[model samples]
Target: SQTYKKRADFLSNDDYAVYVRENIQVGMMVRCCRAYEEVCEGDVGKVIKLDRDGLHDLNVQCDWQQKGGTYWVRYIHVELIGYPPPSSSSHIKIGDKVRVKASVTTPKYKWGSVTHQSVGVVKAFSANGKDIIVDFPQQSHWTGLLSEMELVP
Candidate 1:
């Protein structure tokens, strides 16, 4: 059996919790198994870490930066899977001024097995001029190749 869900177009505010949970898994399906590296080969690369299909962020750190024509990131091991329970987690929000690090969630079967099919955060959006630009942060070996995309979360 596979994961399949159907819901109305309009979602409730208080129920944003459930909304986040369901959609989060959905986002992961699309944005899984990509790469997110700001500094690669001693050069600056676009931030690469997001569920390409899912809007849920897999890795969220300080945006990319460049100095002296070289790229460097502070936390290279920081990788987030799904988001914290939306109803309870307050460490993240649309607009918050703060500095801290979150307990990274290792890539597990958040929804389905087939680990290679997993997605990550977006690294570049303008690679092309179509569709929402995003990257799936993970081992580049996980690049998605299934001809038919299916929902797992």
Candidate 2:
């Protein structure tokens, strides 16, 4: 089960949705939740509008920008963060052991293929350092997105 220090009233599944839809509004900052696949986990974005089609559909404009512009995320996958996604990069070092987020998948590896707490050692990084290569068991190596890796403390 999920645990948080504050907001006792929003512990349940239905109440959680109610809390977000009732409290969230335009200009509010929120972190993406697990209600959708495309939503970035740690992405903190601004609420642009509330879509009426779904119970929690919201138009969220993220800080990240591409050539065409950033995605105006539309989904029921946000939690009040009070700020935007931080600009700092991951703190994992070359030898740091970590695990990839479950949402991240590869062509060769299926969802259940990698255990949730399976450990992998960092090996190298991309030029920009946003992509990291990790050495895992089964004599395998996978390139993981920096944002999707959790430090194995």
Candidate 3:
């Protein structure tokens, strides 16, 4: 799949009583930080990690938004503008200048959607099919990684 890779253990409550949450936390829209001139673009990504827990419901890092853009690359953690990130090896590396792909999604209204909304960046991931996880951010401008979603351009 060029969009998302089923983390091997994704059990949702979207349809047929087997769907999880619908749409990512934020607005579901595929964005990229890659240069507009870059010929090599990575549109889809793997569910290496994602956030799953939080202290507050609104504070819960529900959807690790894959929003790529001209973000501030520092010597700390990977983050976007206004969102935090989870923890893991999925975030953009220091000076990597890579491409990040977030998807504009919502609950599986049909048979291909889910709950991947606001917040951006994936933190933790499914450990061989046990639980689903995403990136854990600390602020509103930071980020980690995001789950994948199929899109059409």
Ranking by lDDT: 2, 1, 3
**C-alpha-based local distance difference test score of model 2:** 0.55
Tens digit per residue, CA lDDT, model 2, 36-98: 444445444556565545554544554321111234554345666543345233445566787
TM-score of 3: 0.17
lDDT agreement with native, every candidate: 0.26, 0.55, 0.25
Ordered by TM-score, highest first, the candidates read 2, 1, 3
What is the C-alpha lDDT profile of model 1 across 1-153, one tens digit per residue? 133232222263224323433433322211112234543322222333323332243332323222112122222222223332332222211111111112223222121222334443322222221111212333322222111111122
**Which residue ranges in model 2 land beyond 4 Å of their true spot?**
1-11, 56-76, 83-153
Q: Which prediction has more favorable TM-score, 1 or 2?
A: 2
Q: After superposition, how far is residue 73 of candidate 1 from its true place, in Å?
A: 20
Q: How high is the lDDT of residue 23 in model 3?
A: 26
| Residue range 20-71, candidate 3, lDDT tens digits | 1222323222222222232112221222232443311221121222322222
Please report, as a residue range, the 10-residue window in candidate 2 with the lowest summed lDDT. 62-71
TM-scores for all predictions: 0.17, 0.38, 0.17
